[PDB]
Amino acid sequence: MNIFEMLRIDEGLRLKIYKDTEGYYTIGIGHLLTKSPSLNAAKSELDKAIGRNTNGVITKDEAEKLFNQDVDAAVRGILRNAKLKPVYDSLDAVRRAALINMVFQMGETGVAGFCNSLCMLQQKRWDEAAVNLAKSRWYNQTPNRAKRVITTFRTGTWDAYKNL
Ligand SMILES: *SCC1=C(CS*)C(C)(C)N(O)C1(C)C
Ligand SMILES: [Cl-]
Ligand SMILES: [Cl-]
């Protein structure tokens, strides 16, 4: 297991434009295209992202390319965020992946809003952090995924992704 395989499990793979859990146009492996309600707007974002006229469909190679860029960007973003970097730096590699997973899903600003939980993680109070992480819109709206990510923070193991 690693961050790519983890997010591949959590995000799935679809080669046509689809709506994510929040209703937003997305493609590939959880590549958000736009929050616009316009499918044409989403198609324009897609073409811009891929570099050709796609008409809403991409290949697996193209999906994986956007995914690599998205993971890279998530990580590099954490390292540039003054609130996130110290927490990330304090973690082991497995828990680092859990934090990247959250950023991938909700963005740096979203994750910065978990300051109560982030402080507990930095302190290595794993059970307490796990309890606090579940007190969130995130957990309520995507409970199965949140549970997997929280288990990863709690245990520092890949147990929640083993049979998946
Ligand atoms: S998110 C609140 C913050 C934390 C966690 S206790 C820390 C990384 C220490 N930090 O610099 C703050 C004040 C942004
Ligand atoms: Cl992009
Ligand atoms: Cl879920």
Side-chain angles (χ1 to χ4, degrees), residues 48-116:
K48 167 164 62 84
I50 304 299
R52 71 183 173 82
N53 197 338
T54 71
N55 198 20
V57 184
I58 61 175
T59 65
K60 189 178 187 184
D61 281 4
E62 290 170 340
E64 287 173 344
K65 185 172 172 73
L66 296 175
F67 185 43
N68 282 324
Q69 296 177 342
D70 289 347
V71 176
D72 191 11
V75 176
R76 291 163 91 247
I78 284 166
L79 300 180
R80 290 188 187 113
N81 191 289
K83 307 189 184 186
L84 301 188
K85 178 177 168 49
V87 184
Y88 185 86
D89 281 343
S90 73
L91 301 168
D92 57 276
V94 177
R95 292 181 174 96
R96 280 179 187 173
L99 186 63
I100 297 163
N101 192 307
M102 294 186 74
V103 169
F104 193 98
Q105 181 181 3
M106 56 176 174
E108 296 181 12
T109 303
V111 183
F114 277 80
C115 266
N116 304 277

Side-chain angles (χ1 to χ4, degrees), residues 21 105 138-139 141-148:
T21 67
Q105 181 181 3
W138 171 58
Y139 177 88
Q141 306 298 134
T142 51
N144 289 166
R145 184 190 184 152
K147 282 174 189 183
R148 291 193 289 276

